[PDB]
Amino acid sequence: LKRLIEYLKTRMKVLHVISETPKSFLQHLKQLTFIERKPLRFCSERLSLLVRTLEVTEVEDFTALKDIATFATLISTYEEGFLLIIEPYEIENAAVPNPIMRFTCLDASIA
Amino acid sequence: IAAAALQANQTDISKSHDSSKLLWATEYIQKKGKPVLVNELLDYLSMKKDDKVIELLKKLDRIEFDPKKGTFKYLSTYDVHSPSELLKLLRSQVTFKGISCKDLKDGWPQCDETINQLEEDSKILVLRTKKDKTPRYVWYNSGGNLKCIDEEFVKMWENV
Amino acid sequence: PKKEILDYLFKLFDEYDYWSLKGLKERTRQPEAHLKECLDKVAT
């Protein structure tokens, strides 16, 4: 998970707008590091079981990793009808450009 | 006779200032690499209950209070004792401020050594003195080879 | 004389914050290399 956060940090610092597939993100993931689709699906269950066993009830620092496990299991299950958008401007009208990765649901019939 | 002189010169820890007692406690904590229990403190200074000394020691940043057993240990600034951790720290640098080697010697007693072999491995961006090759403020080797091309070729590019 | 002069200098910074180094000389009247090592451990 720490090296997954390392991959997310080094893919975070882009300069311009990128709109890639989940397949392209997974391919660059396996190209750079050795993180695979089935562990990225299983990470949500693994983190839930780790939090239940560990008894870490002050999850105030720990509540953010739900987003990362959510995104990882989402992008490692869904690849079509969905696009991964990567932008250098979280706030376009800002003093400094905070960048952003965006996920897009494109079909509403799925749910 | 030397023990008699040491017992005569053994000042009671009820000092004028509590900061001498604190400094002696932090010295005795620092000189042992392992965590030590409360009984080491109670034997060291003539103080038994959980005092203001123990409460401020728990509140101290360099001292880790243990809810498990009451083990008190020194906390170093750099929690890196491996080259892999050092390289990951250097990769995770958010600014280009150099990092000193004395507080890496805190925690990692052979750290300047490993810095020398990684510079030999061209794994860092070292700053060194001219009196001697000195481990100092260092940066992550985002470059290629440090010892890339020979000095005669460097000298003829200087001629260029 | 390490332990006593640490309490004495604790009193000295309690007496005044920016105490002079030249004024530290007569308040110690001790070996200055010992004093320089003791000064570096706490403050300036």
Place this chain on the structure above:
Amino acid sequence: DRPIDDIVKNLLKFVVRGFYGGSFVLVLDAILFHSVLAEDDLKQLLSINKTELGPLIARLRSDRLISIHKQREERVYYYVKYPHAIDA
């Protein structure tokens, strides 16, 4: 920005890396990693002296690489003119 501009930045980087001294490499890498710099902020960031800063800045003038800037807020600033660097 432009990926060709990123190629230009890595190009200047590799030119100094493979063909200049390490102090020049560190100076140019610092001013590309950051942006335009006051000299005091750079001296803080590298903890160096102006005596060491001198010949580096002078040789980077000599190769027509660093575009200095002078304006009062007098405050010294440094950047690189891209066509001057490319044509040099």
